[PDB]
Design a protein around this nucleic acid. Structure first.
Length: 1119
RNA sequence: UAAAGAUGAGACGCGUUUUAGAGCUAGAAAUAGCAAGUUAAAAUAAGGCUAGUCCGUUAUCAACUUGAAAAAGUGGCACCGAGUCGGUGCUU
DNA sequence: CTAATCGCCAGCGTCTCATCTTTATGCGCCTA
DNA sequence: TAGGCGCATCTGGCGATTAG
């Protein structure tokens, strides 16, 4: 048949050959279908398939989580409104209506332009009293008097929208800033309780607090400098545990059980405090100090006369910026003229022009402003502020990101406690408002769907809508967490219907250690062949050794077993090594927590113990572990539960319950574990037992073992090439008669990657035969091959290639993969070389660009300012493009050809027209079901439905003199022709590019140097070839003469310095989008084909995925 | 073995757009001189219904047939030749 | 006057949690 | 003998411009 096929899968291109008759490229005759009277097309069987790269789901997941966050925030505001409505409907009119209707202009607005009150005098009075919301915040904290419901609503709404980073567990007191002056008190309390009175430096407390804050990695040296005398505990990390937190875990001075390794500020810190206090101070004020340092890091209030230090700090920022601005305004206008307009009265330049109503930022403003005040007198008073980057500060910036929800929590609680006397309506909802602050959906629950979504898994205990106040009542948290863990854990491959066991469970880990110890054998001095341990001595080992010491087999069970066999020592062991692998760590952990070993060794309650390990391996949070352990609280409450809940396990296994102890053999009545315990004189392991001869374990395995195989990870770009290659082979088998190919060769898209499993799909499809001994034979081979062979063959036999000329190189790589792969097989190098030279020279290579309907975002994301243009598209249907707009430049999906009548001019007499029209992504579905209505609504009339042709991206057109174009946009054309550059220029041009690098160490340097020196006329001949090809198919005469002028002048550096730049003229000639390029000093701008009108009267081509079957439509006949 | 990604789940801080923050003085304006600037509301793919505190940017893509559809179909041969596929003979 | 040319512009940084797969090691083994 | 299994160790859009 000589149907040896080949392939070269890639990220953006898949190549293919079809046969290797005489290990040569074949040629074959095909006919076409369509209006053209041609049928004698004799093609090659070589081709390449180019396509866009496959994108990952990371960006899509990011936008999905973003819109989920947005709608949850809107629902939080809606809950806020639901609480406030019953009194705001009586205190105000259309309040939330006018807050929702703030986008619209005064013509579209229905109530009032002013969003807060609805009056102008009250608005300006409110703004002059409070220039910033934080002034109102401080007023509602320190007022001690009743205020307006609208203002307190704005305060709570501000905190609910802008909430906090949610990273600190526990609580922080808002008034814990005077305790920052009690750091000396804390250290002196530690001194008086200690028995050496350690010394300290007074007045350095705040200085050392900011010094250690700046010295994040030099905190050791900072603590050594701040604490004199004894500093071993400070260098160990005790003082950093007091101030910053116990980031390390090393022991400083012990004194609390084994070591002081408890968490500083977390959910487990309170539980770990009981264990530290059991072996018992300084921690009580150390926690307050840890609050104080983080408070003073971000909230700088020197004297505590307020309970709202965030608002106090923002007021200080406002006052500093105002005072220093009115200093600079009076200084610059009196010292430096001719700049005042540029800094103060500009908008489109950096400085204070762009810092307020322009697009400039803080860094650009600082960089602009430094030379301005670097040269005047009375300076450096602001350069010192500039060096600390707190010059002319604004409040709402990036720096207020570390703001704690604990501070907003206690701050809102402070306002509610202050104001609850005056308003009894919202006193009763204080706890649920506080919940609305603190409500988060846990990460193990997921979206609150009903199974229609492909992402949610949560199980509802009760059927009701989910609110923050009924979350624990409606949602069953334990089953939801179990499903969350189980939906992403793999199944066991032997039987895919059951879940696998945890890595550190009793039965599982016991089977691992039993599988090792059954393989552990003993050798005799009499009989040379060692016999397996077996007997009841397998039982005797584990209870006497493994149930007593953690990791008994670390060069230690050896001497322990030698003492056991001290009279049996004529018989010696033949174990794997001195240190074994498995252990009874879970056994000994729960042993050291438990006080009863009888039931544990009784090996009967392992059903209970499996659930015991299951909860600790599955779940994380202490309370939600606790509720599941409450079933055994009838006996495990007092002396177990205090220590067992602190233990947690991490790790999942690969075997399952049903396989390991469910399936037993009827001839013996014993399961696999009992087979390992009492297998007889011959002990078979897991692999030997499951696939043993005359064993019924294989029949039950095959009973349950009998497009979805593509999910093999390896990025979501490679899978596109895999499926395209499968489709290409599937469609090629149809073309080449109906016979099955000889063999398949596939390329790299390490050998352990997705390619090995990708070959198996080709096996499963091609070697499809009867299971009984017909699929046992392999009619066809599928081969994957290492790239070093084809690269060395490339360097050996002079088939070089630069990637910048043409896309024929993809198909030639696929061809060379097939040739060398088949060449290794036929003899178990040849006469091929002249034939392969001929093959790579050939001008007809079936290059197709995969026509694809575009999907993705509708348009650009930036919201542009309003303008009098039709390019802008309304952001929402409610709004208007020219009024607000901002969304322009949409991405089209595909084009269509249409012929119809249309009216134009003042005559209103109708003319006929034939057009190409592009459809956008946003309107595609509207086109599909309403084409006849959609094009008539868009402007045509009396349209003929049967003449409409759909045209995706990269639709191919053919014009006069063999000129082809591809259509990417609606009306922008891309180059469709390829430069069939002969091999004489390529062989020269590679060696010219390699004039000084990799020209051949074994005296191959000199010959290749003189070859390109003596063939320098090839430079001129390539310029003529590019020129002739460009005048015929490219039509780039202006850029061509520009290039010719640059080529003629740049000849003083004529050896290979042309050649690297000559590679850049091929950027003009390649297929696809035109690209700008540089040629020596001159830079050549791209020329863009807008004239889509010429393809209306051209010939349209439809091509198969391999390109061998074509369909041509003559658009002149349709006109 | 640490990194490395690849998947889902829960949260922050900016940015943009429109709107609200009464501009004054002398001049026909031409404009000129002058105060002033730090904040807030709404939206954050149009939208879809199953009306969920859910879904909407990943992956799927030649025409001509029969299928409402999953799909199943669909168009001879060999030598001699190369400028983006031609010549000739067998052949039915 | 309506169609080619030229220059410019494209939404962003941090946290927390889980699973699985890979650069590279064996031990006990097995099927084709 | 290869292949598997269990456990660990940038390129289309758009406004301003020129111009055939």
């Amino acid at each position: 048949k000589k149907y040896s096929i080949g392939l070269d899968i890639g990220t953006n291109s898949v190549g293919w050959a079809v046969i290797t008759d005489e290990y040569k490229v074949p040629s074959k005759k095909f006919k076409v279908l369509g209006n053209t009277d041609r049928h004698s097309i004799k093609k090659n069987l070589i081709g390449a398939l180019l396509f866009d790269s496959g994108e990952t789901a990371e960006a899509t997941r990011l936008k999905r989580t973003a819109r989920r966050r947005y709608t949850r925030r809107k629902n939080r505001i809606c809950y806020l409104q639901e609480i406030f409505s019953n009194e705001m409907a009586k205190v105000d009119d259309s309040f939330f209506h006018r807050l929702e209707e703030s986008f619209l202009v005064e013509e579209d607005k229905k109530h009032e332009r002013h969003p807060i009150f609805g009056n102008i005098v009250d608005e300006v009075a409110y703004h002059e009293k409070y220039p910033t919301i934080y002034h109102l915040r401080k007023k509602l904290v320190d007022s001690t008097d009743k205020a307006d419901l609208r203002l307190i609503y704005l305060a709570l709404a501000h905190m609910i929208k802008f909430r906090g980073h949610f990273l600190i567990e526990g609580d922080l007191n808002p008034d814990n800033s005077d305790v920052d002056k009690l750091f000396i008190q804390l250290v002196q309390t530690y001194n008086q309780l200690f028995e050496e009175n350690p010394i300290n430096a007074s007045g350095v407390d705040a200085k050392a607090i900011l010094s250690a804050r700046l010295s994040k990695s030099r905190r050791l040296e900072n603590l050594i400098a701040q604490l004199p005398g004894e500093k071993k505990n400070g260098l160990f990390g005790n003082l950093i545990a007091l101030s910053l937190g116990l980031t390390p875990n090393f022991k400083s001075n012990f004194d609390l059980a084994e070591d002081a390794k408890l968490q500083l500020s977390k959910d487990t810190y309170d539980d770990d405090l009981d264990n530290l206090l059991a072996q018992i101070d300084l921690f009580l004020a150390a926690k307050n100090l840890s609050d104080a340092i983080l408070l003073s890091d971000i909230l700088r209030v020197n004297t505590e006369i307020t309970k709202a230090p965030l608002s106090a700090s923002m007021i200080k920022r406002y006052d500093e910026h105002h005072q220093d601005l009115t200093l600079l305004k009076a200084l610059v206008r009196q010292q430096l003229p001719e700049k005042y307009k540029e800094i103060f009265f500009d908008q489109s330049k950096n400085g204070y022009a762009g810092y307020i109503d322009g697009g400039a930022s803080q860094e650009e403003f600082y960089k602009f402003i430094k030379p301005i005040l670097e040269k005047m007198d009375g300076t450096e008073e602001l350069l010192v502020k500039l060096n600390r980057e707190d010059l002319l500060r604004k409040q709402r910036t990036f720096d207020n990101g570390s703001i704690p929800h604990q501070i907003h929590l206690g701050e809102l609680h402070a306002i509610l406690r202050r104001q609850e006397d005056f308003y009894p309506f919202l006193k009763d909802n204080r706890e649920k408002i506080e919940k609305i602050l603190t409500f988060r959906i846990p990460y193990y629950v997921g979206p609150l769907a009903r199974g229609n979504s492909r992402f949610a898994w949560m199980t509802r205990k009760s059927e009701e809508t989910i609110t923050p106040w009924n979350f624990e009542e409606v949602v069953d948290k334990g089953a939801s967490a179990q499903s969350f863990i189980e939906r992403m854990t793999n199944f066991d491959k032997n039987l895919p219907n059951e879940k696998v066991l945890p890595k550190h469970s009793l039965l599982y880990e016991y089977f691992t250690v039993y599988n090792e110890l059954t393989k552990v054998k003993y050798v005799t001095e009499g009989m040379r062949k060692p016999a397996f341990l077996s007997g009841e001595q397998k039982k005797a080992i584990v209870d006497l050794l493994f149930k007593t010491n953690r990791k008994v087999t670390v060069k230690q069970l050896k001497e322990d077993y030698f003492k056991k066999i001290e009279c049996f020592d004529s018989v010696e062991i033949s174990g794997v090594e001195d240190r074994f692998n498995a252990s009874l760590g879970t056994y000994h952990d729960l042993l050291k927590i438990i006080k009863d070993k009888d039931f544990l060794d009784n090996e009967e309650n392992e059903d209970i113990l499996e659930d015991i390990v299951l909860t600790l391996t599955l779940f994380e949070d202490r309370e939600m572990i606790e509720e599941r352990l409450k079933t055994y609280a009838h006996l495990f409450d007092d002396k177990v539960m205090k220590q067992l809940k602190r233990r947690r396990y991490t790790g999942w296994g690969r075997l399952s319950r049903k396989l390991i102890n469910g399936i037993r053999d009827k001839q013996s009545g014993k399961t696999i574990l009992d087979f390992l315990k009492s297998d007889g004189f011959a002990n078979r392991n897991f692999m030997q037992l499951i696939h043993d001869d005359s064993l019924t374990f294989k029949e039950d395995i095959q009973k349950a073992q009998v497009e979805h195989i593509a999910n093999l990870a390896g990025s979501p770009a490679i899978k596109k090439g895999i499926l395209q290659t499968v489709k290409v082979v599937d469609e090629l088998v149809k073309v080449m008669g109906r016979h099955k190919p000889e063999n398949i060769v596939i390329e790299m898209a390490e050998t352990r990657q997705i390619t090995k499993h990708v070959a198996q799909i080709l096996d499963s499809r091609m070697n499809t035969k009867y299971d009984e001994n017909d699929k046992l034979i392999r009619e066809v081979k599928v081969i994957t091959l290492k790239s070093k062979l084809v690269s060395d063959f490339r360097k050996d036999f002079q088939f070089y290639k630069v990637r910048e000329i043409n896309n024929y190189h993809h198909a030639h790589d696929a061809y060379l993969n097939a040739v060398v792969g088949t060449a290794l097989i036929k003899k178990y190098k040849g006469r091929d070389f002249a034939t392969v030279r001929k093959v790579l020279s050939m001008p007809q290579v079936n290059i197709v660009k995969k026509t694809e309907v575009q999907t993705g975002g509708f348009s650009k994301e930036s919201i542009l300012p309003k303008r009098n243009s039709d390019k802008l598209i309304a952001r929402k249907k409610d709004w208007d493009p020219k009024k607000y707009g901002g969304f322009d430049s949409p991405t089209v999906a595909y084009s269509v050809l249409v012929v119809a009548k249309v009216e134009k001019g003042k005559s209103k007499k109708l003319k006929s027209v034939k057009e190409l029209l592009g459809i956008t992504i946003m309107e595609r579905s509207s086109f599909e079901k309403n084409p006849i209505d959609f094009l008539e609504a868009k402007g045509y009339k009396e349209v003929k439905k049967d003449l409409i042709i759909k045209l995706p991206k990269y639709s191919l057109f053919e014009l006069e003199n063999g000129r082809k174009r591809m259509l990417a946009s609606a009306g922008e054309l891309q180059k469709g022709n390829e430069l069939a550059l002969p091999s004489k220029y390529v062989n020269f041009l590679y060696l010219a590019s390699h004039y000084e690098k990799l020209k051949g160490s074994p005296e191959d340097n000199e010959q290749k140097q003189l070859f390109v020196e003596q063939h320098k006329h090839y430079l001129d001949e390539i310029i003529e070839q590019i020129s002739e090809f460009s005048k015929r198919v490219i039509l780039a005469d202006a850029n061509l003469d520009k290039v010719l002028s640059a080529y003629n002048k740049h000849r003083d550096k004529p050896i290979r310095e042309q050649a690297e730049n000559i590679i850049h003229l091929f950027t003009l000639t390649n297929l696809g989008a035109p690209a700008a390029f540089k040629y020596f000093d001159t830079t050549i701008d791209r020329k863009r084909y807008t004239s889509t009108k010429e393809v209306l009267d051209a010939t349209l081509i439809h091509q198969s995925i391999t390109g061998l079957y074509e369909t041509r439509i003559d658009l002149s006949q349709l006109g």
